[PDB]
Amino acid sequence: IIIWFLLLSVCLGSLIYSTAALGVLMSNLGMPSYCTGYREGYLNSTNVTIATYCTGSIPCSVCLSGLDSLDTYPSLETIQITISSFK
């Protein structure tokens, strides 16, 4: 029962990896391919973050792997800190 679902998840992950490999081959040799649309739309878009552009979709994020994004900077964060109370 559970084994069938695990195998389905493995096959879906393998298909996603195949699409990622196709995208890598595209970035290396061109290329008119599966991942052209997402990257072409994202390059001209004003969305500095991938979360708002891809809306959390897995294939869109997979096609966009390898490009610079605002989310890559950890120094822009600011952890809220409570100062010392008293003596």
Add this chain to the structure above:
Amino acid sequence: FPNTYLEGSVRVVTTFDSEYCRHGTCERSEAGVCVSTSGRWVLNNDYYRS
């Protein structure tokens, strides 16, 4: 942020018995009035009073 009545080189502020927070830093202060000769951040506590 607390209410203020003068801004610039010299500042005057008023506080209540509640904690105030700014960007990345929250602090606790008591009600009162403070006067500063410089435009630095001011709150009513022993640390700033020293």
Add this chain to the structure above:
Amino acid sequence: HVMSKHTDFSSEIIGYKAIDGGVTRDIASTDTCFANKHADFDTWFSQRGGSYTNDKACPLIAAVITREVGFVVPGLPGTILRTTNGDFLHFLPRVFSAVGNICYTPSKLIEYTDFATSAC
């Protein structure tokens, strides 16, 4: 992804500033690591005798520019521009020449030298 260097808008830049913890701050020669996207910053820092190592876990470098470049994103200082190669850039536009790093009060805008000891 590996950061790259670009030289666009080099003639419009007066100086450079550092962004640490989401707040812009001045640069000192004792700092040892930065995240950089510009090549002229190497000449800017070498003339002062400084050396550094590039890493993503270090304060970013932003250039003070006299030309309105990029667009404003809420929550981020200055302006953000994306290169033709996909890399992003940061700049500090200004209206008047006497500008360092400016922070926002709820009513007015006041310059500061240190965020920890200012009305920011």
